Write a protein that binds this ligand. Structure first.
Ligand code: ZK1
Ligand code: ZK1
Ligand code: 9C0
Ligand code: ZN
Ligand code: ZN
Ligand code: ZN
Ligand code: ZN
Ligand code: ZN
Lengths: 259, 259
């Protein structure tokens, strides 16, 4: 039967094509995870329907209702058969679904406006001219809250107390604050998105320094899924064939706007 | 029985309190519609639980499955008893749920970066230096697509074909696009949100021109609800008591940042 694929509208993983209103089904979409889904489906021998997650979320368990939201919720409640998306591999998610081996690495990184005299996390931690922050309710904030590393502890102590708030509700808001004329703000976010935005007009931001942690994105299936093993082996095959590296280069660089 | 209220996290209608993690139940939330819900419940004599709509949407019928999403779907399918939110009164919605009389007026409006030489839709339509657009899916786009008014037809013809795309996925994206544009992008959106953002730091956007249409937000109940009549009379009583105007002033202006 037709496999229901849950995914999320996040660039460049899944984007609406030019002329999407004239198109139907899977042809409406393009991007890294659209290309990845087509290859996974070929290698595993299934036909599929791409669906955009109903709530636009990745997946977390509400502490009060005990209900999972996002793509993880769609898998655990039987709304979708597989999630093919930049879904971070985490312990609480692996307790309720199965992840493939990762298809992409990422880590916390620093975004500056070009010109800002900052090249690293240590640089941020040792000055006060440039403000810095992150999403108000996510994994980057939690990384800093829990860290026992001196540099990151110093950064957290600053961020938690800073006035006005250095936290933002969205990346659109965070990047707008980086870009504001004489804004003197740096934004902490996933390296993959920082690198992506660095390749988009107006070409005024950059990723600086090394990543602060190491994580991976994986494909997720529900417990006991007949697809688990084949999907896992397919991710490894695509890596060994060089296809994952080719797709990253395609969507970040070949289609990049900053030279 | 405890009435289940569906609502949506949209500022300043319903927002998480700063200290929401320390709070429980209805006390976690604040905003115009939180104040409205408390007064409607008092007038109608019910106890209630505020819930945030699972999919984060207002309500539309999928053209293929024919299934309603959002708060409208929660009412239609029996998941909530009442929706107390900035839910626009429309024909297709009124066919499937009942709306109260409106509690607030709105219409499509133009957001500019301060200093942009635009005072009206006609001004936008007669030039090309300043790009303009709206949400990629929604009622504003549909208004333009369907209009027979010469100015609005001219605007639609431009927007539908503009490259790069003038459409955005979210208002956070639209507002950020206005803010970095040096005035070369204007964003079309509901007047109530445009007015709200004009009162938020960094105080660099303005609402300009008259509204392009006239609509209202209403409280919605499923067909056959025993609450319909009382909710409707309550909305009228609150208006006659001055409370609706008092709440709009409280949440838009008393709590504004640009005065
Ligand atoms: O599984 C997850 N995958 C995620 C993938 C991405 C992206 F980079 F776009 F791929 C992001 N971006 C963060 C930067 O702004 C744009 C959204 C967030 C993700 N989150 C929430 P977080 O871990 O709180 O950041 C997850 O949970
Ligand atoms: O019932 C509806 N009520 C809505 C109320 C609001 C708000 F202004 F926040 F109150 C908005 N905003 C549009 C501007 O960006 C933020 C969200 C959208 C609404 N939509 C979707 P639309 O009609 O496609 O715009 C509805 O359907
Ligand atoms: C008193 C308040 C609450 C300010 C109000 C809000 C909206 C309207 C309204 C005007 C014209 C057309 N329509 C379309 C049907 S509507 O959405 O029910 N309302 C209107 C009138 C008064
Ligand atoms: Zn067709
Ligand atoms: Zn909850
Ligand atoms: Zn919070
Ligand atoms: Zn009253
Ligand atoms: Zn589009």
């Amino acid at each position: 039967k037709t496999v229901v694929v849950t995914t999320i509208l996040e660039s460049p993983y899944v984007m609406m094509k030019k002329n999407h209103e004239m198109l139907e089904g899977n042809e409406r979409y393009e991007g890294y995870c659209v290309d990845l889904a087509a290859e996974i489906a070929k290698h595993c021998g299934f036909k599929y329907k791409l669906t955009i997650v109903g709530d636009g979320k990745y997946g977390a368990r509400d502490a009060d209702t005990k209900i999972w939201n996002g793509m993880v919720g769609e898998l655990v409640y039987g709304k979708a058969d597989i999630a093919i998306a930049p879904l971070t591999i985490t312990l609480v998610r692996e307790e309720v679904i199965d992840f493939s081996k990762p298809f992409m690495s990422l880590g916390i990184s620093i975004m500056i406006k070009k010109g800002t005299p900052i090249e690293s996390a240590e640089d941020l931690s040792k000055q006060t001219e440039i403000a810095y922050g992150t999403l108000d309710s996510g994994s980057t904030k939690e990384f800093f809250r829990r860290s026992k590393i001196a540099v990151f502890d110093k950064m957290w102590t600053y961020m938690r107390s800073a006035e006005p708030s250095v936290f933002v509700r969205t990346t659109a808001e965070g990047v707008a604050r980086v870009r504001k004329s004489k804004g003197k703000y740096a934004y902490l976010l996933e390296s993959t998105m920082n690198e992506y935005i660095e390749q988009r007009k107006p070409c005024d931001t950059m990723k600086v320094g090394g990543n602060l942690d190491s994580k991976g994105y994986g494909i997720a299936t529900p417990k006991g899924s007949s697809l688990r093993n084949a999907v896992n082996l397919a991710v490894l095959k695509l890596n060994e064939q060089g296809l994952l590296d080719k797709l990253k280069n395609k969507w970040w660089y070949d289609k990049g706007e900053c030279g």
